[PDB]
Amino acid sequence: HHHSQDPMLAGVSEYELPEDPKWEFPRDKLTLGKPLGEGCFGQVVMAEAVGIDKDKPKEAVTVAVKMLKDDATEKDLSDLVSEMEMMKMIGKHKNIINLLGACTQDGPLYVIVEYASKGNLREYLRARRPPGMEYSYVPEEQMTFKDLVSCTYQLARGMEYLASQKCIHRDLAARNVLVTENNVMKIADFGLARVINNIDYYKKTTNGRLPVKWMAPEALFDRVYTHQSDVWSFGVLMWEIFTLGGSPYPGIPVEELFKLLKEGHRMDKPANCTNELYMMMRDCWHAVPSQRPTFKQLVEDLDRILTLTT
Ligand SMILES: *CCC(=O)N1CC[C@H](n2nc(C#Cc3cc(OC)cc(OC)c3)c3c(N)ncnc32)C1
Numbered sequence: 094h095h096h097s098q099d100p101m102l103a104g105v106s107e108y109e110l111p112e113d114p115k116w117e118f119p120r121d122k123l124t125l126g127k128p129l130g131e132g133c134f135g136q137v138v139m140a141e142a143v144g145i146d147k148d149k150p151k152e153a154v155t156v157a158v159k160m161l162k163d164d165a166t167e168k169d170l171s172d173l174v175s176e177m178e179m180m181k182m183i184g185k186h187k188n189i190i191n192l193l194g195a196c197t198q199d200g201p202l203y204v205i206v207e208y209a210s211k212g213n214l215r216e217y218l219r220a221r222r223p224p225g226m227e228y229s230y231v232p233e234e235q236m237t238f239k240d241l242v243s244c245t246y247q248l249a250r251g252m253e254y255l256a257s258q259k260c261i262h263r264d265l266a267a268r269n270v271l272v273t274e275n276n277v278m279k280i281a282d283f284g285l286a287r288v289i290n291n292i293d294y295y296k297k298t299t300n301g302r303l304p305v306k307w308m309a310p311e312a313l314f315d316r317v318y319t320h321q322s323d324v325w326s327f328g329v330l331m332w333e334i335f336t337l338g339g340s341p342y343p344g345i346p347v348e349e350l351f352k353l354l355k356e357g358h359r360m361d362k363p364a365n366c367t368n369e370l371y372m373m374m375r376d377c378w379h380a381v382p383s384q385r386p387t388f389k390q391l392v393e394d395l396d397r398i399l400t401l402t403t
Pocket residue numbers: 129130131132133134135136137157159176177190191204206207208209210212213271280281282283284
């Protein structure tokens with residue numbers, strides 16, 4: 094209840110955006126809270142939004158608010174506005190992080206999206222590992238095989254939707270998946286139409302990730318990003334899930350990786366994986382993009398296995 098809720102006027106604010114009343118959320122009903130992790134494009138913070146849910150208009154809801162740093166550039170603003178406008182176009186699905194609203198007027202740009210209490214899939218899985226795997230300080234919340242299949246099936250449904258809405262993710266991985274209070278799998282950073290300079294697929298990111306380990310060959314060499322290149326990434330995502338937060342091509346330097354994939358070597362079958370499920374992973378990792386399965390096929394396959402295990 095500080096000066097984040099206090100309106101900004103004409104003659105102080107640095108930029109003016111256009112308002113869409115359908116999407117606009119009033120600043121005085123938004124209460125900014127604890128910041129959610131460092132890194133990625135801009136800042137994300139927890140907040141309480143009163144009446145953001147039209148199914149409970151008098152009830153305050155916990156939301157995540159994406160915003161710009163105080164040293165952000167004209168392009169950083171443009172890139173955030175484009176991400177917002179693309180999420181409006183792509184529309185809503187259960188298994189993606191959804192645009193709830195925006196504060197575009199009377200101060201800095203806030204983009205309000207669904208809050209996921211259980212955090213990202215990697216940290217969610219690692220925490221819910223059984224005894225016998227690397228863990229550090231709930232037994233009821235421990236994962237079963239059915240839960241790993243269910244989790245995979247949900248993310249396939251999500252990607253089927255994004256793909257049907259002409260959306261190419263380009264960075265599908267466990268770190269860009271979030272898990273809600275009711276264990277719903279939601280895909281994140283899917284709106285990013287961002288162009289990047291200063292590329293380095295050898296140097297590790299802030300939290301030690303090498304995003305090249307999720308990239309399809311044609312995405313690396315030719316910078317060709319399609320729905321089929323997303324399917325390769327979904328393959329590596331499947332590995333992450335069935336290793337319960339396993340780091341792909343573990344201990345393999347980036348140089349060796351390119352040579353390894355060229356020679357036709359892929360990652361080994363995880364312990365918790367079935368032969369049927371591993372053949373799905375290996376189908377995703379076909380060198381030829383057109384020989385990979387579509388997300389429509391992955392959903393139908395995973396729906397079949399999920400009804401069987403149950
Ligand atoms: C950006 C820093 C980061 O990666 N975090 C991971 C965990 C934590 N965290 N981030 C989000 C988010 C988000 C988000 C924002 C936008 O802005 C338009 C779009 C989007 O999908 C397209 C996703 C978190 C949420 N929602 N809940 C909990 N932790 C979150 C920081």
